[model samples]
Target: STGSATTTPIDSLDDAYITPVQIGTPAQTLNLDFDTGSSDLWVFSSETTASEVDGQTIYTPSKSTTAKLLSGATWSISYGDGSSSSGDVYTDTVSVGGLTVTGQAVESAKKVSSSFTEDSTIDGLLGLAFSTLNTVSPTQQKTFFDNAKASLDSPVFTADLGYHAPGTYNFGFIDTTAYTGSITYTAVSTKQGFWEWTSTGYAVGSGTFKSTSIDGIADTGTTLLYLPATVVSAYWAQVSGAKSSSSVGGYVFPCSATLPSFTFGVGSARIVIPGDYIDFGPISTGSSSCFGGIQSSAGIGINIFGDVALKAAFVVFNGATTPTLGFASK
Candidate 1:
């Protein structure tokens, strides 16, 4: 997820897989995560102060003769990790996934921190989420999707995540072939910056819970699935021998047996969460031993169907042509 505005300690660094599209050409290829949550495409640079630099891949704009700098404009951004950077704006020919785009404006951070300087796996971030949250003004600048939408075969863009793999979050034009058929489309709710929806309820095995309803946003940027306490409790009750274990965090059952399948209803759509997701083991100390999908975000107040839920289906963000989101079977 693109780090939130708050300042927090850096936890860990992972490779961010994003497709880079050059400004004036058809060339595009995968660059690391160039975030859509924020507008600026920033990277570590040779000119960056060593003290401010961290473990991020730095792109040497000086190496590209076509690079152009936007004079008098300065930019800075803070991640959820609390680490931040400030730099000058520049434009150049950039390539990702074999597509080259020209006149791409990027931020060359002059100052970064050691926390970010030490990570070598992560190169940059691609902000493909929404334009409203863009750090750079769209009126004066172009985003990766904004510049390449016209040439893209489909008007839609999709991000597919291979969570278990080292470099799994892949971005590019939406591949219709990967989907079963036509996708169900829902209009985007402008009220919330997130993609909101009304969840009718959820079902466990053959039993269904109709009394409880859920309303929240679905964000691919987040790594885990977060839901209301009531919903989480009810879900656990359906599992034959499932019980809430404080030691495990939320709800956890014996690892030796397979758990039941749970399905969540959104409108008329039913999304199933396999047993493996519920019986995940602990990866570290003090960390709850649970599936990657379920988590306790009780204070956040909103339910978020993060990447864990997103990977089960094909999702399309249609912000380019209309205020709509599309979903299909993988």
Candidate 2:
């Protein structure tokens, strides 16, 4: 079988994208962020503290006859941005689009950070990363994709992220018309529980492509493109008046400045990111200076090709015996 779902960006800046998922026997639909960066299918639930509950929807396990408590099982997660959520585990029927999985472990949030509570639109996160990254104690649970892959016609899933628009996430089969050029397949290492791969190099605007191995993870959950400091500096130096600002917390420049395109290699393919995509929103409300979508990842330890880069092409997460990632122009 197969499934298809629409992931809509929650804000104009495409800060986060969410897809509606069904849980429990009667199907309680909650909007969840399909994050490839993490591996825990947790949700806001009745178990959550009242103070943490706001306008976000919560899953009530008691309402579902199929809900079964995984006694003594607990899960916790801390994100790079300092936001976090944690709780106990319950197995229940879960469905995405039309694909269904029985006895899927659903983490019920007992506590959440202020940042999560403040985001009214996001109810939870459905991790698409490998199961090895699962935080559940005693035994790690498989992700929704992992659980349903056996029933799918194909074991792969694809991400087609859009810019200020709605995109599609499809399972079991790739949508041929969703992309243009032939896919450039690259081996991925799941050792770190991420879609980690190496890029051939990069180029700023029409500059010469630098031949270097840049290792990074294709993280949809991250909002910005983070690269090595030297590469980030090289890209920004081409733009006049562009400078790193302590107050802005990153590279910033006049909103009207002519930004240059960014190109990164996937094997032999060169995916070009438009200048406007790099021109992130204003530094502050109504401010003339804008924060750059591309930033230095010196402090992050690992480079992250986040949504800013993912939006430039179609991505395939091939969950074969030897997992691989495929990138194609779209």
Candidate 2 clash figure, as a count: 0
Model 2 lDDT, residue 260, Cα: 94
Candidate 1 per-residue C-alpha lDDT over 109-206 given as tens digits, one digit per residue, 9 for 90 to 100: 78776655665544455555554544543234566555655665555556444434322222346565767756777666646555666666777666
Lowest lDDT sum, 10 consecutive residues, model 2, at: 246-255
C-alpha lDDT (0 to 100) for residue 166 of candidate 2:
96
Off by over 4 Å in 2: none
How much does each candidate deviate from the true structure in C-alpha RMSD?
A: 6.5, 0.9
TM-score of each: 0.73, 0.98
Position 171, candidate 2: lDDT: 91
The candidate scoring highest on TM-score is 2
Would you give me the overall lDDT of model 1?
A: 0.56
